[model samples]
Target: SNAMTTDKQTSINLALSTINGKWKLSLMDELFQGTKRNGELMRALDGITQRVLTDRLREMEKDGLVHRESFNELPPRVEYTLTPEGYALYDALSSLCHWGETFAQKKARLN
Candidate 1:
């Protein structure tokens, strides 16, 4: 049981590392609505620096959770959208939110 628990802890962290950054979940939330350009993302997520956003996007792209498309326009254009795996994470977040809601309700009742 102890060995199994230790392995599970490592598995959990490995899975979470993909989405561990502060901005990742919020980025996905916006991408969930539809594709967005870099500036659009900056506007949507206020207070996130351009540097940080790009880094986060790059990480997500590497993780296979985000798809980035570039256009061959004079000024150049790029768009970001969630991959199927990203949607799976979104669904998991929904369930986690549900659990938080239930827990909040229970705590309120107790109080």
Candidate 2:
């Protein structure tokens, strides 16, 4: 009954799409420290506009990778953290970073 596997490319691409983009990994990294308010994230990720940051976070929320909490206060306190599903990606991302380092240095040196 488990013989039918999902298309290889489709599955990997789905995973990539969820974490792709310049700000995603960075966002996740920041969130790893613990919950941070929207403004705090904005300051941490300089050069990112409000719209782009908001859009990306909302998308991540939908993906079940990030948890968003909006406190009902006069100033409004919106914080973000990683879900267990998202945290599961840390090791994979770290492995990729390690590989990238060697690829950049060693692989490039080979030429």
Q: List the global CA lDDT of all models.
A: 0.91, 0.87
Q: Give a tens-digit lDDT track for model 2, residues 1-111.
A: 123775767776787798897699889999999998888989999899989998999899999889998889998888899999889876678888999998899877998
How many backbone clashes can be found in candidate 1?
A: 0
- What tens-digit string does per-residue lDDT give for candidate 1 at 1-111? 357547877866776899979899899999999999999999999999999999999999999999999999998988899999889888887898999999999999999
lDDT against true structure, model 1: 0.91
Error of 2 at 25 (Å): 1.9
- For every candidate, C-alpha RMSD to the true structure in Å: 3.3, 2.8
Error of 1 at 109 (Å): 1.6
What would the TM-scores of all predictions be?
0.86, 0.82
The number of the candidate with the highest lDDT is 1
Residue pairs clashing in model 1 are: none
